[PDB]
């Protein structure tokens, strides 16, 4: 009745650590009944490492909590693949990233931001890189009582905002802001540990003489930003200047040097000179320019918006029994974004074709089994499936 | 007796402007007597633009001082080439860059540097890019009397230094440094205009609580530096931290991940964490790592040193009369650095060979004239010459 096919398939990235570990559930379907092997995505199946990686039974692969010295990347940092084979052929579950992590002494800091009296400011905390993948700001705090809770950009008209990305965006800064500390507070997506920051940053108001001019730090002059659909985000324009600058957001028209001012609304709001947006629609992608200006000078910052969607792969049809030397209607239905390239293969073996519809005009005996599209990309991947019954 | 050959040849880059303009002297040698054409280095000779470019007579090409609206890049920003041809063939003078510039309202600024009490600091002045090629710092000044003169790195043991590159390097910063202004003072290599800076920067001492850690701004974490032989320069390591950090300079061994601490001497001195060096010898080139450390944390900065020399090209020999179907001893003598690629050609026409010794094993009639090596690179170029008399 059935060739193979995936019911319980492993959501791509899967992370964990010593002091908790993990194990990975892949079970397949068919009506002989698909034998789940676990392999590296490089063809070869996985063995058994005493004290860490070990082939369980009940549709999974267990990574024991491990002595912090039993970490070895060959095990704890690899791409695995549920192999799903029967007598009609085999299929490979999409890239599943094992990432065991040694819990280690982390802590975020809150620096001083140095500001020209009257300008706005954006404080990040910082979260060292190694944990940065699983430690994210969830609060801010005054030395004077106040809390600044994250949001999906609910309110807009006000001195304080926590950006979608967890920085605290002060709309303007009087000197009356230099007596008061701020600490940030991440939380661990794995352990669950809420913890404050080793230090707390003070605001340094610097009163200006006469005038100054707007300019920007190199790592603020060229920004790249990725967000997912229907989620909220913000575009930044980090400039200072006395007197205070005017920020002008324009979107470019695709593949031109002509541009088009960013219209503001209930969806698109600017707390100058930052853009803050909800419902991250897919047209939103593209390139943006922020143009900042005062009586003394000007400046600008390009920014590249890449809104992303949940991509997919499915063939058309999932089962085609042919006739001995026929066509091959092997299209694949879709939605999602971005695709960095779709792939093809048959029975655990990569073939070579890399386009929408697969077709081998003259069928064969060794030309039947399971064929799968692979809609990859840089930070993810989805998969499809098709079997070739015969006449 | 002679084929062509260059006596008065035009030193590569040559710059000037409206309100002064220029004109370019190329005269050639031989004993018929080489006719100096002026061409674009793209084969085609240059004509006569009323009011700007104009073929003079007495071995030159005059670029009249021009109304600021008579600038047109097709004239005032191109590569020209004295063509030197007789009856024995032609030669092309090396790339000579015409750069007419519209004098325009320039002015440099001196910013505040924000410093953790006790740390060192480096102030640059912000000579905008357009003039930056011809406006360079030649002084620094206190609001309190003092002058900080440039040097080739004479003294070392002291709080203040002007780096080879005209930044003022304060060795350390007490809070007693926040009442006092500094202005810098460039001078124009063309006009001759000494002028101060639109504004003058104050030192902002920030007293630390407990501790902090050393870290670095992205545009300081990966440095590239070029200097010429026998001149003086400095390697930078821009890090702050309380308590105050230790900076450790190491040179790498070429093409390894192993390294070797930078030894200090009369030549190589460190005002931590900066290196400051005179007599820029050619071994000096290479990669360097600065390693900075305190009880709270660490950090590092790679740096790439490319000491340069005055390259040259000369063939071996400058005249060879052959025999009808002979070898070709066309080697080229040398010193200099770096070469981005040597070139070859014959009689104003590029041929295709790009290596040390030219040779066409079977000579011909249309295979005699002048042959020239072209030892180019990115910010310069030198040239060679050879003629083929016959039997
Ligand atoms: C072995 C285990 O399951 N738990 C350990 C935990 O006790 C420790 O905090 C860490 C070692 O640094 O690694 C993990
Ligand atoms: C920094 C770290 O994770 N080390 C921990 C240590 O604090 C603890 O005594 C032990 C408990 O299991 O695990 C390990
Ligand atoms: C890196 C780090 O924080 N080290 C921990 C520390 O909390 C403590 O000295 C001890 C408690 O058992 O375990 C270890
Ligand atoms: C001031 C004004 O009217 N527009 C200027 C524009 O000409 C320039 O491209 C830019 C420079 O940063 O700043 C803005
Ligand atoms: C035409 C000429 O020879 N001199 C002019 C100078 O008067 C002026 O300062 C500038 C125009 O901005 O360009 C040059
Ligand atoms: C900014 C600039 O260069 N403009 C000058 C202007 O100041 C002067 O009146 C004239 C004198 O030749 O040339 C032009
Ligand atoms: C750009 C600039 O500085 N403009 C100059 C200014 O010095 C003056 O208004 C005038 C003097 O003739 O010429 C013009
Ligand atoms: C502190 C020490 O002993 N050496 C460290 C080294 O392990 C590290 O590579 C670097 C990190 O920035 O700082 C230095």
From Swiss-Prot, chains A, B:
Subcellular location(s) per record: Cell membrane; Cell projection, Neuron projection; Cell projection, Axon; Perikaryon
Summary of the tissues where the protein is detected: Secreted into the hemolymph (at protein level). Expressed in brain and eye-antennal imaginal disks, including R3/R4 and R7 photoreceptor cells. Individual R3/R4 cells express between 14 and 50 randomly generated mRNAs encoding distinct isoforms.
Disruption phenotype: Early larval lethal with disruption of axon pathways in the central nervous system. Dendrite arborisation is disrupted in da neurons of the peripheral nervous system, showing increased levels of overlap and fasciculation of dendrites from the same cell. RNAi-mediated knockdown in embryonic and larval hemocytes reduces their ability to phagocytose bacteria.
Domain named Ig-like C2-type: residues: 4-99, 103-197, 214-306, 310-389
Record note on domains: The ectodomain consists of 10 Ig-like domains. Ig-like domains 2, 3 and 7 are highly variable in different isoforms due to alternative splicing. Ig-like domains 1-8 are sufficient for homodimerization. Dimerization only occurs when all 3 variable Ig-like domains are identical. Intramolecular interactions between Ig-like domain pairs 1-4, 2-3 and 5-6 cause the ectodomain to adopt an S shape conformation, bringing the variable Ig-like domains 2, 3 and 7 into line to form an interaction surface. The cytoplasmic domain is required to convert the recognition and adhesion of Dscam1 molecules on opposing membranes into a repulsion signal, possibly by recruiting components of signaling pathways involved in actin cytoskeleton regulation.
Quaternary context: Homodimer (via extracellular region); alternative splicing produces a potential 19,008 different ectodomains and the majority of these show strong isoform-specific homodimerization. Interacts (via cytoplasmic domain) with dock/dreadlocks (via SH2 and SH3 domains); the interaction is direct and may require Dscam1 to be phosphorylated.
Functional summary from the UniProt entry: Cell surface receptor involved in guidance and targeting of growing nerve axons. Required during Bolwig's organ differentiation for accurate and efficient targeting of photoreceptor neuron axons to their synaptic targets in the brain via the P2 intermediate target neuron. Involved in isoneural self-avoidance during dendrite arborization but not in heteroneural recognition and repulsion during tiling by related neurons of the same class. Involved in regulating axon bifurcation and divergent extension in the developing mushroom body. Essential for axon arborisation in ellipsoid body.
Name of the protein in question: Cell adhesion molecule Dscam1
């Amino acid at each position: 009745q059935k060739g193979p096919v995936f019911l319980k398939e492993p959501t791509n990235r899967i992370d964990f650590s010593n002091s908790t570990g993990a194990e990975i559930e892949c079970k397949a379907s068919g009506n002989p009944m698909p034998e789940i092997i676990w392999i590296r995505s490089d063809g070869t199946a996985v063995g058994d490492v005493p004290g860490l990686r070990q082939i369980s039974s009940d549709g999974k692969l267990v990574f024991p909590p491990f002595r912090a010295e039993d970490y070895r990347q060959e095990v704890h940092a690899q791409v695995y693949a549920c192999l799903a084979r029967n007598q009609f052929g085999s299929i490979i579950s999409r890239d599943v990233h094992v990432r065991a992590v040694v819990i280690q002494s982390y802590e975020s800091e809150a620096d001083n931001e140095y500001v020209i009296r009257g300008n706005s400011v954006v404080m990040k905390c910082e979260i060292p890189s190694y944990v940065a993948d699983f430690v994210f700001v969830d609060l801010w705090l005054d030395s004077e009582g106040r809390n600044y809770y994250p949001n999906n950009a609910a309110e807009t008209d006000g001195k304080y905002l926590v950006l979608p990305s967890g920085e605290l965006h002060i709309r303007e800064v009087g000197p009356e802001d230099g007596y008061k500390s701020y600490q940030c507070r991440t939380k661990h997506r794995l352990t669950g540990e809420t913890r404050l920051s080793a230090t707390k940053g003070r605001l340094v108001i610097t009163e200006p003489v006469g005038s100054v001019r707007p300019k920007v730090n190199p790592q603020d002059k060229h920004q790249f930003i990725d967000v997912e659909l229907a989620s909220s985000y913000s575009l930044l324009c980090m400039a200072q200047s006395y007197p205070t600058p005017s920020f002008r957001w324009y979107k470019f028209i695709e593949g031109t040097t002509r541009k088009q001012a960013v219209v503001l609304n209930d969806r698109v709001k600017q707390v100058s000179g930052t853009l803050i947006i909800k419902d991250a629609v897919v047209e939103d992608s593209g390139k943006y320019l922020c143009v900042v200006n005062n009586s003394v000078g000007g400046e600008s910052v390009e920014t590249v918006l890449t809104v992303t969607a949940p991509l997919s792969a499915k063939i058309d049809p999932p089962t085609q029994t042919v006739d001995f030397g026929r066509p091959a209607v092997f299209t694949c239905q879709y939605t999602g974004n971005p695709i960095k390239t779709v792939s093809w293969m048959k029975d655990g073996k990569a073939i070579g074709h890399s386009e929408s519809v697969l077709r081998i005009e003259s069928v064969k005996k060794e030309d039947k089994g399971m064929y799968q599209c692979f809609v990859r990309n840089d930070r993810e991947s989805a998969e499809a499936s098709a079997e070739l019954k015969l006449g």
